Design a protein around this ligand. Structure first.
Ligand SMILES: *Cc1c(COP(=O)(O)O)cnc(C)c1O
Ligand SMILES: *Cc1c(COP(=O)(O)O)cnc(C)c1O
Lengths: 417, 417
């Protein structure tokens, strides 16, 4: 007899294996599937390598980091993260390192914050489309459930007050304890930063009902165009809202996107609620960052010229690449939701859809992965309520590869009417 | 409004507290409380630093590892762990790197293996005295309960098949669904390796009631005297036990205790159940070892010479220290449970008590941690059913410190009769 969790254990994985069974490689398999489904940021690893070399060395006082095992981590780590989080939000706000908490990547930060704010049975509101890991991350071992907040293309998938309320009030009508709402800002798969007002309109609805607002700002430093990224933190430093319960406000973070170090498993939880801060720290012991990696990060994120050079450079490349991939599709007549951040773009393949069904959508998908041989992500995968949208990632390959993927798309669409 | 867990939150911390305030140190505080309550293994860190000055690439391919994020881990990591797990258990039984799963230290390994085996409300049998962290690790976020199994000093704290049946049936009459039994072998705080025949018994009864047998063999490579350490994996290999169902047997391991690298968070789950293996893997996303620590370790553990000398040296240093420490305590009449493993000894201070009540043990405990300035652990914190026993860790300090500590003890005992 295994537990229910293990005992209760594949459709959207089609592109996943199509890739694994035929990965594109310039020399080994130049016609294989090109991985465009993982939101990875490798445009600036070279800059990190240059650093790990000379400016200075950093990684290995071994005994100290080898035996250190406090749920608080190395002081410099906390300081560096808080420091790094600051520059990311244009110094517009400050972060108290004593509040910095660790988790096994954003994965663990998410599961932990949920464990800290909701009981099994309770529900959390999530705007859609939304990162699918949530379905497991926020729901698998927490028992908590999800309730989507509708979003259309007609308004660029913006989060509207009416929609936030409608979803919420329906839950009450369904006797479902709603304890919070979890945003992703910058957005995934939308790749767009949230409008200052929109955030206030959410925090307020959140505050007005004493429910928590969990901001997943894991894509903060991947902004590359206007508008500016507005942290929920910055909205807690504004007069118009000096009277908001800071107990219902939590931020989730990681170093996976704006430094591309997912393997380092650097999950961060920054609560404004002292109690939550603690529980998350006690829970942080199940997913503590490696002292070796902590030591490595403290040193690295402490170099301002670097942390300041990296941030600026990283914004450039991402923009340089996004624009290219954007013009690339504008050429063959493909439109994307306009975005300013992230490691991907929300592609509109609606004009290729026969009818307007998710089935029609999945078929187009089977073609892109078997015949176009590109592994992209189908909108229905992010719980998108309208067929035709596909998330396409462009930050994990060469310019050469991108242009190929672009060339392949040219033929597909070209032969589509 | 936080969750029940977050809201459901210091008696035995006077020791950890005292130490933090008046921390011992040869020059700047020769009379600070000595840290003898942490099971840290520092006797061979010098061995690791030495090694760190050679072959191969101790720590940098960077883009590859910085981005590698497969729940399976770096290619060479699983194999290294398995080869290490073999050298450990004699090299007599074999381990399959494909079945090796990560977790955040033993802490994460433990919580996960329970998440996989029992549902909230279910219970697990635990011999006592036992590892206090279990009370959080095994029950907090799992809704699982622990059921103690009686052990006394009349029989050197051995687990008797009678004692096991009693807890099992006692629990059933009360309608508690026992889903498994979790051992610690080598033992914490007893610091003893388990009698092969005893394992064969626990496994028979275990297999005979369809409940899981989880083994925390986190202390496998700290044996410094006979008998030899017998892994449950070896038991699954004898002819006399061919019909035991391998679906119900599992191993929890880590590098914290034997390798002295707790800050590395190298938790390992090794299940003989293929489903558990799959589930545990899905769960590893929450607590994965850092690709950097993985790389480093793959390189260290892939060095047969280092590994041989390390294990061999560790056994001798832990052997020289343990004996020296016990011979000192005997000089003054103080005796401990006879052990061949661990990084501590089960000290019997029953004759320094006033009454066989935990109220006397705690009275003495304070004396020991304020006036003698030694931070140890009171038997009752290990759920030990009889007062007077204390766990005293002797593997993290210098030879100089141990004698200082012994000296303080030689005194306290002196002025007590
Ligand atoms: C990629 C991604 C993550 C992953 O963060 P990890 O630290 O690697 O677990 C989390 N959230 C979103 C929205 C992502 O796109
Ligand atoms: C020390 C210990 C642990 C903790 O292992 P970590 O890797 O440091 O988390 C777990 N279980 C037992 C029985 C221990 O002795």
């Amino acid at each position: 007899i295994l537990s229910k969790l293990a005992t209760n254990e594949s459709p959207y994985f089609d592109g996943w294996k199509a890739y694994d069974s035929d990965p594109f490689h310039p020399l080994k398999n130049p016609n294989g599937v090109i991985q465009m489904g993982l939101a990875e940021n490798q445009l600036c690893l070279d800059l990190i390598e240059d650093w790990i070399k000379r400016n200075p060395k950093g990684s290995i006082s071994f005994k100290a980091i080898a035996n250190f095992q406090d749920y608080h981590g190395l002081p410099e780590f906390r300081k560096a993260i808080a420091k790094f989080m600051e520059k990311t939000r244009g110094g517009r706000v400050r972060f108290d390192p004593e509040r910095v908490v660790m988790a096994g990547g954003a994965t663990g930060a998410n599961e932990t914050i949920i464990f800290c704010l909701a009981d099994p049975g309770d529900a959390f509101l999530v705007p859609s489309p939304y990162y699918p890991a949530f379905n497991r991350d926020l729901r698998w071992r927490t028992g908590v459930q999800l309730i989507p907040i509708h979003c259309e293309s007609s308004n660029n998938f913006k989060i509207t007050s009416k929609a936030v309320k409608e979803a919420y009030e329906n839950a009450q009508k369904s006797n479902i304890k709603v304890k919070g709402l979890i945003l992703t800002n910058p957005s995934n798969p939308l790749g767009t930063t949230l409008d200052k007002d929109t955030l206030k309109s959410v925090l307020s609805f959140t505050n007005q009902h004493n429910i928590h607002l969990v901001c997943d700002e894991i894509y903060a430093a991947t902004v590359f165009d206007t508008p500016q990224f507005v942290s929920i933190a910055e909205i807690l430093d504004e007069q118009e809202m000096t009277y908001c319960n800071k107990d219902l406000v939590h931020i989730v973070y990681s170093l996976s996107k704006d430094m591309g170090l997912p393997g380092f498993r650097v999950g961060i939880i920054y609560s404004f609620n002292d109690d939550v801060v603690n529980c998350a720290r006690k829970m942080s012991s199940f997913g503590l960052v490696s002292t070796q990696t902590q030591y490595f990060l403290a040193a690295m994120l402490s170099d301002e010229k670097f942390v300041d050079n990296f941030l600026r450079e990283s914004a450039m490349r991402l923009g340089k690449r996004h624009k290219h991939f954007t013009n690339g599709l504008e050429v063959v007549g493909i439109k994307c939701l306009k975005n300013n951040a992230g490691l991907f773009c929300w592609m509109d393949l609606r004009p290729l859809l026969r009818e307007s069904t998710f089935d029609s959508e999945m078929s187009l998908w089977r073609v892109i992965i078997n015949d176009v041989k590109l592994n992209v992500s189908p909108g229905s995968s992010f719980e998108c309520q309208e067929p035709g949208w596909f998330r396409v990632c462009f930050a994990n390959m060469d310019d050469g590869t991108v242009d190929i993927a672009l060339a392949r798309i040219r033929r597909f669409v070209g032969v589509e009417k």
